[PDB]
Design a binder for these strands. Structure first.
Ligand SMILES: Nc1ncnc2c1ncn2[C@@H]1O[C@@H]2COP(=O)(O)O[C@H]2[C@H]1O
Ligand SMILES: Nc1ncnc2c1ncn2[C@@H]1O[C@@H]2COP(=O)(O)O[C@H]2[C@H]1O
Ligand SMILES: Nc1ncnc2c1ncn2[C@@H]1O[C@@H]2COP(=O)(O)O[C@H]2[C@H]1O
Ligand SMILES: Nc1ncnc2c1ncn2[C@@H]1O[C@@H]2COP(=O)(O)O[C@H]2[C@H]1O
Lengths: 200, 200
DNA sequence: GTCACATTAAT
DNA sequence: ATTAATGTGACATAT
DNA sequence: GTCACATTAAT
DNA sequence: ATTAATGTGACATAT
């Protein structure tokens, strides 16, 4: 993309090791990010530390954009590297200037914000309409469709901790274990620790 | 605002009576809206008709924007007039042209989308971290802060059905009634049908 | 779900 | 070696 | 929460 | 008049 390589030429690339935190919730937002390589997890915490993953973001996604349209904004969530990342970065101020010379870069940003509101809205619906089992089931099918999913004779095989499934759907690690077990007894999946074969 | 009156001069104003539906979920998105007067409710439904209110939008808010950044998009939710509305409307195509002559109008749009992602994300957190009572309690305090809230010697008085509270927080009408009653026994509110006095 | 431990994976 | 995850049965309620 | 009715508000 | 909301006690489970 012509608009992207141009935008990236005004950015300073930073690398982050896996598991590090790129953005800290509560801090002043003055910088925009863009994932050149790798993936991250956007998450929020309650008053007592419980974590909920709002979304995963990968190659080609902007991050830290919510503070751009108004002064004195704080990061709305935490962002941690899921894999080692290579992230381009640029101050809001300089980005606002590129928007003036070319509004097409703001168009790329908004396209993702729109998509984010659509998917976060769908997550509101899952938390309100589906029980924990329905939410886990849907999560498993989503993961089984992803790129990093391995092929298997009876479906697709995925690797994930019960802690992270619990963080995505909103339940304890113990609850995830009990439901995985129930889905297995129904012959819908095969669970062996962190390995899950989703039949299909 | 100079940019707004200009943008609105390329829009065609339509009026809608209260309770009517401005946008239908599932339909082709080819038009952008903007509330000149009145308020609406953005909502989603499950497979069996249960409704969840994602947000209320008022004077000065854009609507129908999620389909703008990609062809063949469908409305992601339902939008109904909460009060009689006066809504400016414009095709995506013409709006895209105004964006080129002036990118500041896209800046106004994105500011709201960002704000929407922040508040919808906070709603994800409420559904995941707070029990029904906590969600109702928070809802009551929010309503008591709003413009249409009436003053009262012991706090603020609000009018709302138990059906709508249930639609905002994600519980049955019967559940709302039982929790309102419990909050009253704790002297936190005074509930007389649709009238709620939030003490504070 | 939380709790209290007992068992196991994982670096 | 230790640290990061798990597995379990008993429970107290909220949904 | 859902269910089955009995009671009441609201136009 | 009717239609739109509610109020209730008994329950079956999921959280
Ligand atoms: N619901 C969400 N989905 C995806 N990304 C999000 C979501 N909420 C916040 N973010 C991202 O996480 C970032 C946290 O800091 P900012 O608010 O600056 O910008 C935010 C977005 O880039
Ligand atoms: N409603 C919730 N109840 C419990 N844990 C939750 C909830 N929402 C998110 N979580 C998180 O998901 C995690 C799943 O594994 P843990 O039990 O280690 O810790 C849990 C919390 O950090
Ligand atoms: N979470 C949300 N908060 C606020 N407005 C929303 C939300 N989800 C959808 N909308 C609005 O409702 C509209 C439904 O149709 P569109 O998807 O075209 O555009 C959507 C937005 O204008
Ligand atoms: N999880 C949920 N359970 C029940 N009703 C819900 C839920 N989420 C949203 N709702 C809606 O909220 C409404 C509250 O009043 P009702 O019982 O008439 O109907 C309910 C549904 O339309």
């Amino acid at each position: 993309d012509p608009t992207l390589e141009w935008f990236l030429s005004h950015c300073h690339i930073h690398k982050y090791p896996s598991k590090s935190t790129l953005i800290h919730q509560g801090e002043k937002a003055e910088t925009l990010y863009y994932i050149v390589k790798g993936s991250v997890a956007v998450l929020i915490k309650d008053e007592e530390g419980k974590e909920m993953i709002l979304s995963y973001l990968n190659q080609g996604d902007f991050i830290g954009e919510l503070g751009l349209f108004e002064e004195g904004q704080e990061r709305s969530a935490w962002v941690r590297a899921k894999t080692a990342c290579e992230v381009a970065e640029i101050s809001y101020k300089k980005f606002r200037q590129l928007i003036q010379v070319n509004p097409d870069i703001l168009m790329r940003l908004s396209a993702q914000m729109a998509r984010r509101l659509q998917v976060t809205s769908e997550k509101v619906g899952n938390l309100a309409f589906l029980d924990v089992t329905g939410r886990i089931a849907q999560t498993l099918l989503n993961l089984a469709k992803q790129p990093d999913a391995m092929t298997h004779p009876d479906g697709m095989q995925i690797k994930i901790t019960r802690q992270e499934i619990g963080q995505i759907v909103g339940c304890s690690r113990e609850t995830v274990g009990r439901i995985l077990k129930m889905l297995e007894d129904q012959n819908l999946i095969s669970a062996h620790g962190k390995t899950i074969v989703v039949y299909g």
